[PDB]
Every structure is written in C-alpha cells, then in structure tokens.
Amino acid sequence: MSVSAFNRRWAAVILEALTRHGVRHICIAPGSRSTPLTLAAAENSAFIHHTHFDERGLGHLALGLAKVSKQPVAVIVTSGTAVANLYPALIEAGLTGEKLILLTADRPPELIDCGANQAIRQPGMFASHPTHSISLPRPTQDIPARWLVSTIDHALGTLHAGGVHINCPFAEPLYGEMDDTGLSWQQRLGDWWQDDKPWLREAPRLESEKQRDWFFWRQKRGVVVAGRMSAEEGKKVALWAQTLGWPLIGDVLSQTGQPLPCADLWLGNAKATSELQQAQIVVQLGSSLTGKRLLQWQASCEPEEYWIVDDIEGRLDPAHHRGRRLIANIADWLELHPAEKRQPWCVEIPRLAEQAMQAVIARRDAFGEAQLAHRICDYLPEQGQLFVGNSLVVRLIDALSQLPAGYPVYSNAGASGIDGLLSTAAGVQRASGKPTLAIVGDLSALYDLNALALLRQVSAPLVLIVVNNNGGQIFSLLPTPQSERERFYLMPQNVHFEHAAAMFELKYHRPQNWQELETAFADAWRTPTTTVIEMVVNDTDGAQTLQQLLAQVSHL
Amino acid sequence: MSVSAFNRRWAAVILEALTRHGVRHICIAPGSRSTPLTLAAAENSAFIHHTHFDERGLGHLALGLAKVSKQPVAVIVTSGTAVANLYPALIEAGLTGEKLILLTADRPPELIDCGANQAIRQPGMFASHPTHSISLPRPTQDIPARWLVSTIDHALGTLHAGGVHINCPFAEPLYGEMDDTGLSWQQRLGDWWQDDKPWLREAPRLESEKQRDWFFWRQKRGVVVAGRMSAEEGKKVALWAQTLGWPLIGDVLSQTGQPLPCADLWLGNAKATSELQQAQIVVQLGSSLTGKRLLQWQASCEPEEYWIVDDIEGRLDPAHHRGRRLIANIADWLELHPAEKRQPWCVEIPRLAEQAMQAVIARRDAFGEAQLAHRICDYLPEQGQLFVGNSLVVRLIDALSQLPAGYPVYSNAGASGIDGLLSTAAGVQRASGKPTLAIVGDLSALYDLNALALLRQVSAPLVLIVVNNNGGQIFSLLPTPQSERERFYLMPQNVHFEHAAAMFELKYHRPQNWQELETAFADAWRTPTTTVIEMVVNDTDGAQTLQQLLAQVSHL
C-alpha cells in the first residue's frame, strides 16, 4: 500500500533495535531522503536528540558523546556529500574505539548511476574504516522484520570498538499520513517490541588470556609507560607502578598524576637514557603517546620484551619490538597481573625529573602559551574535565605541566586531526554534564568555526581557550625550511575571535596578563554557558621556549 | 644516501609531470608529511599556488578553479583526516566532471596499522569515486623515474573527466639540505625535463559517432531540454532549437536565454503537458535538471525516443527512457547534427509561458527571496558571472527568472551539497578573474563559514548575497510533517552575518528595501573585494510564494 508508511515502519525497526544495545544519544542533520530515519528517531522516546547543520561537525559531536559516555552513539544524515562529511570522525573512531553508528539515507538502487539529483554510490564509500558495514536492501515486506533486526543485532552485538556504517535506501514517496502498511509485518516480532533485549543476542568478548609468567617478569627491572586510558585507570596504574618500584612515564592523556613529570625534557638527558637501558621489560598501558622524546625513546629502547596493554585491537608499537600485544580492559588487566612491593631500581631519573620541573617553574612568569600550558593545572574546573586540542597545546601540556591523578582528560589523538575539535568538545561536555575546559589553537578554531553554534548549548560552563599565535606554530618547532615556512606551512590567517563569539552570542575575553586571565576564568565558571577566552601570544615564543628547555635539561 | 633529498626528487617528478597535462593551479593545505610534495610544488614556477587551512574547503576551492578553467587542478594535503576532508569535492567532481588531481601524502607502509600518529589506511579510501586511483610505492631509486612519470601520464592522459587519487607515501627524514641524492636517477629522463610534452602520450578520445538517421528525426515533433552546459553552448542550443521550431525548455544552468521561461510553473498546467504528449522525440543537451515540474514531466513523457547529449559519461536519464545516450562536446555535437529550418509546432505552450511570467511579474514588489530570484537578471554584473547556491535559491531563480543567453552561470548541482559553496565560489572567481555574483542560503553560509577567509582575496568584485530565512526553508516547500519540521528539518540557527564579515574584514550590508539593495550593489562593484549582503526575509514567504504561483498558473 503506502510506500511512505512502510519506509517509516522499516526505519522504526532499525531505530528500536539500536535502543537494545545501549544507544541513547542520536545526532541528526537535516535532509529529505533521511525522513524515515529521522521521523522514526523523533518518535522514539529512548533517545536524546542532538542536531547540527554541518555533517562533519555532527560526526565529531557524536564522537565526543561516545568518547565520554563509552556507549554507541547513532548518527542520521541524508544522501550525498552529507554522508562523505562523516569520514573524519569515523576514521578517528576506528583508531580510538568510539562506537559510532552511522545511519546514512540513500536513494534506492533504481536511482543510482543515472544522473539523479543528490544520488551517489554509498555502499562501501568508507572503505576499510568502519568496523562493520551493512548495506541494507531496498525496503520490502518480502524480507521479514526478523532479518532486519537480526542484521542490526549482529553488527551491534559483535562490535568490540569503532564505527558501523549502515546504508539505508528509501524510495519516494517519503511523505504522507501513516496508515497500517507494514503493521502486521512489524507484529511478526511479537512482544520483542515490549522487551529490553536484542532479538538476536550475539555478544562474543575479545580478550587476551592472563600472562602466566607475569610473576617471573615482575621481578625484573621494568619501566611502566602510561598512554591514553580512563581517569580511574590512571590512578590504578600509578599505584601499581609505585608498588612495583618501576619508574612511571605518564602521558598527558594518562591521568596518572605524572610522578616523573616533564618526561619530554628529561628523556633528552643522557643520564636518563643510560639508566633506562637497564630495563629488561617495558609494560606500556594505553597508547597514542604524545611526546617526541618519549616516542624516540620507545623506538630506541631494547628490552628483552615490550608489552602493550590496551582495549583497542591490533599492533600499537610503531617500533615493532619483540614482545606482546595484550587486548584487555586496563583495570581488569591490572587485577590479573598484580604488583608486589619491591624496592625501586631507579636512582637518577627521579632527581632529573624534579630538576626538569624546577627549570620550567623558573620560566613560569612570561605571558605565553608555554607558560599557560605549564600552569594549566591552576585553571582546571573543580569536578570537571579537560579537552586538549592537537598540535602545540597537547605537546606543551605534556612536556611542561603535571596534571592531577584521576582528573579526566579527553582528546582526538588517534589521527590527531585539527578538523573537529570544537564540535568534539561540545559532545564531551554534553555527555558528562561536567564543567569543561577546552584548549585549541587558532587554525584549529578556524577549521571548526561553525561548531560555535553547538557551544551555544552546554549543560555546564565550558571555557574554550583559543591560543592565537597566528598560524600553525608547530611548523616553527619542526625544522621546516625558512623561505617557504610562512606561506606554505604556518599559514597565518591574521584574525581574532571576538566577532566569532559575538556572532553566536558567546561571552568573550582577550586577557592581556595573568590577572586578567584569572578574572576571566572566575567570570566564566559562573553560568552553564560557553565562554571564549582568546590568548594572543607572540608567534614563535612557545616553540622556542620548548626548545630552550629541552636543551637546558639535556645538560643537567 | 639522503632520504629527505630523494623524497623531494621523487615528488619533483610527480609535479613536473602534471605540468605537461595543463595543470596550472595547485591548492595546498599545511602539513609535515606533505613536505616533499609541497616543497616540490613551491619550487616549480609553472604553478599558481593557493593555500587554505580547511581541507574540505581546499577541495572545493580546487573544484571551483577546475569548474571555470576546464583544466585539471592539483591538490596537496598531508596524511590523516586531512585526506578524508577532500571527499565531498571529489564526489561532486565525479558527477560533473572537474578534473581534480589529489596528491595525498601518506606514511610509509611500515608505519600503517601499528598505532603510529596521524597514520591511517589511505589507498582506496575514496572507493569508486575517483576516475583513477594510483597507490604509489614507497620511494626508491630501484624503481626508475620513467615508471613514475609514465604512471602519472597514463592517469592524466586517459582522464575523460573526474578526479584522480594519487596516494604518495614518504618516509622520514623529511627535512634536510638538498644534496645530489637522486639527481642521476632524475637525469635518466634526459631532455624530457626541458620538453613541454608528457613522457608517455596516451590520450584516446571518447566520443559517440554521428547519428546517421538525424535527418529523419529532425523532421519530427521534437522538444529540446537544455541542462547544464557552457555559456557558449547555451547560445548555440538556443539558435538550434529555434531553427528546428522545437520548444526549448531551458534550465537556470543552461544559459539559453530561456525563451519559454517559468517552466517550473507552466509545466504544472495540464494544457502544456497535453501539447507535449505530441512530442515524438526529446533531445536533451546537458543534465542535472533543476526544477521539480521538469523532472516530473521528464519522468512522465513517452516520446518514441529520448536522447541525452553531454560530455560526461554514463546514464543521465533517471526515468530510463528508450533512446540514446550520446557522449560528446555539445557544441561539436550540434555541428555534427545541424538544424533544418522548420515550422514551429507548439502553439499552446508559448501562450502559457508568457502568462506564467506575467503572473510572476505581478508579484515582483515584495522584498522577499522569491522576488530577489525573479529580479536577479536585473542585477547581474556586466561581463561577470553568477554562482548559484543550492536549495531554494537555484529552484526560485529557475522557476521565476529569465536569465540572459550566454551569461555564465556556475553551481555545484551534481550532488547538490550545501557544504562547499563559499569556497567553490572563491575558486570560480579566481579562475576567470571576472566580477562575480554569488547567492547562497543561511545554512549554506554557516556550513562553509570559514571560507570567508578565502574571499579576502578576489581579483575582481565578488558580491555574496546570503539569503537569511532562518533555516533550511526548502523543508517548508516540501510536505514535511508540521510537528517535527522546525527541530528536525528547518533547524533555524537564529544568527546574522554581520560579525562574520567583520571577522574577515569584509564590507557588509543588511538592506531593508530594494533601494538599499541597489545602493549596496553600486558600492560593491567599485572594488576588487568581496562584499557580504545579507537579505533577511520572513522564513516561509519564498516557499509559499512559489506554491501560490504554481497553483495560479496551473489553473490558467
């Protein structure tokens, strides 16, 4: 009977199926071809709905929600380039594990490759980047509802991590009153409609077995390297390493409290690398290590064995050491491989680390981005979370600051894109409802500028610091050629962000000194709104300061 | 010996090869992994270099340059999500034929799938959308330069239309003084370096043969449908149709002069469809037809044969008529199949078209987007070009205005995305150097908002009209459900664009009436800068006006 009615019945099964796998948040962009999905979603009381007009920002908004909530988040877009714009968030999700469920509306098969408007080839368009890809057939009652829900349940049930592409063709008519078309078809699922479980429960778990020789290896001289993990895992790793008597090299993304802070500096000292040569095992928990010195030490070190523990799959050691790749929840893994109190074997490095931090503290006064990074632990909102952008800020905080154990830090450090940091920050805030400090560079803020529209709706104060050093000053840190550097690398855009904030009715500060910065923060945390704080600094000071501190510490 | 040096020698070959196939423009985004490509490009004096920080916008900038220049345009980006951001422009280029050459830097094979920073799986990531895909090997002197240049020459020489993905892995070190590493390797190409031709000339032409029964068919009752084509082709098709005595239904994208204007209205009149039932042949030149009534007539008509002539490949008739799909340059095709002077056979449709335009003229006074569309022919810059955005603006101009024959119109009407219209307009302007009138909707301007950065550099005046009807009001034209319409379709953002203009130091007007609009136009054309003109209109008036005019004309 009614094609428009059956479309919506077909879509309703898809959306209800997702609710059985923990999907609560759904992000929707506008369109006509997506009508069946969007109307099914709007009518379903299980969902929290988010909307946005930029599908690239929408994908990153979903990414942020998933990142914090640790639950699958659904996305609906219409056919065409709308779908292509989801690629960046999907790729990042493939690397760091967020479960993004992309429901992409499509033209029906009879309107593909025939010059039809807004019709493109969508099945397989994300290549190997989704964990799962489902290309749904043209809706028909001749395919039973139990097949459709089973297909969804397989994809969601077996999803360890990463994105799922569900391509959803619908034929016109898309609009019209609902009649009973497809009602008996849906009712073939019986009381599944009132159930809270999937139709098909397929939920195999992926996990490495416990290492039976751990009690032998924990007696050796080891090093613990902590990369990205949960806030609670960071605290557990810190206690575990301390009990082992092993030095802990903690990333900015680890939330370990970084008991040997400024590793990007002291790892540059020969006394440190000499001491680390005594390590017979390295146990790394988490991944996406930030610092250049740490990545260089990892690459050069030659322990008998190198282990990486993390809940994402695949090789995670870019230096390809002999060793082990252990897939596990980090907290669970630590219970299975407990520490026993042993005397610490390091003597030189704890001293060097304190001296490194003292060197940074000596240079804390200048009103620059290096100093802001070093001091950032003074501006963290109480009971809040930090979102750190890419390029210099994550590098400077990692090298120069000591972040509190267990204080939540979030980032897009898988592919380290500068293309979705504001929209991601918005999702991070909405997911937890916590006060949020987000720090990004100027090109980063320009890239995702229209995500300021989203930041008009936050459930707690969000401070967005934009460090404006007029270009991508990471290319003043890298040894790029001087003659081509400004035009072809730095690409200064010579803007400020006061008018951007005004456009979206966001409070704005451009503090000129530390006192004005503290005043701006004091103002900002008072209300559940986003405040833009623009820190304008001399282009190359941050990069040069990092270089000078590396050199100073290397001579200790 | 020097990897950094050889990287650049390898890249230099790739870029020099491109110059032999007409590549003059190259668009570059910042990065480190792209260094060998970017330095090779910067050093090659054959190129005009464009830069931008948003890779999605960079792709659309290239699309605009290619759109106007009719030459291949190269793009360089670094590894990671930078690459994914090129997808929307690549997809649009696949549909409408722009030759985009995407040089995407990559990590070397040993750094893929091992948790390395900013490293993703890039070969094949654009699936079937490029016309050609090259996955270059890890650079080595053991592969001769003649292979590398021949591979490039094959891809460019055989390229009829659309994009080419050239994935370019480079291993570190990326930086360092240039030495003689790879010089003798390059010199194996001999005096090709001083030549102006490809190394391998492979340029087969793809073209349909003369239709030997054209003298039979040109005597029948025919209809000419004109879609997107060049400005010169538009003039030629108009004279050809007039000579044949066949009615010409001309799209806004056709530049035919639209002798039977307001087709979206008079095709709604049953007397017109009845007269058109007498057509024995339909000859369509160009594709991507704009109007709903035209698309519906195309779908319903049943001539003995339906022909589509266009220089792009594949089926272009979404109604799948019995007939012919003829691949040719439209101007060439018309010379091969010339018109014969014959008596016009339509009598009712010329009456209706006139009455339809009078109906529109009667409503010309209100300060609304429907009226702006109708009157836009009165505001076209002399010796300039029009860039029409997607959604209501293109529909309303097509339905309500009569554009002058041979006056150049540009658009992204392949996939009709609202995601790249400002950056595309910038490229359209830079390519021709002509005064440019660009018209887009508010969600469109927000989507590509940071492209205002690009519009700070235009070589002739560019007027950007932003029609602000507070949301995607095409969804007030479509029969979307009232209860969900605002939140899930229209998505009003409740913004103005005064601060956006101020941020990028662009002059701004918000005219309240026609006099103020004309004053704004007069100011704008005086300097080689972009002027933003925001037309704030009542949300649903445009859609409703179109609906009313359709009804009025249908009852004539």
Ligand SMILES: Cc1ncc(C[n+]2c([C@H](O)CCC(=O)O)sc(CCOP(=O)(O)OP(=O)(O)O)c2C)c(N)n1
């Ligand atoms: C979407 C995307 N496209 C381009 C890049 C490249 N890229 C970077 C990669 O780290 C650079 C390594 C590499 O290319 O190998 S950093 C960077 C500049 C950020 O400038 P900003 O003013 O915000 O901060 P600052 O530098 O601290 O002043 C860019 C533009 C990217 N990461 N993502």
Ligand SMILES: Cc1ncc(C[n+]2c([C@H](O)CCC(=O)O)sc(CCOP(=O)(O)OP(=O)(O)O)c2C)c(N)n1
């Ligand atoms: C990148 C991308 N993502 C989403 C869309 C969907 N889409 C459209 C398709 O025409 C709608 C058919 C369809 O979905 O089948 S029109 C439209 C809103 C335009 O709003 P604006 O304020 O600018 O203009 P107005 O409507 O005149 O007021 C959208 C958002 C798209 N085209 N491209």
Ligand SMILES: [Mn+2]
């Ligand atoms: Mn910067």
Ligand SMILES: [Mn+2]
């Ligand atoms: Mn609008």
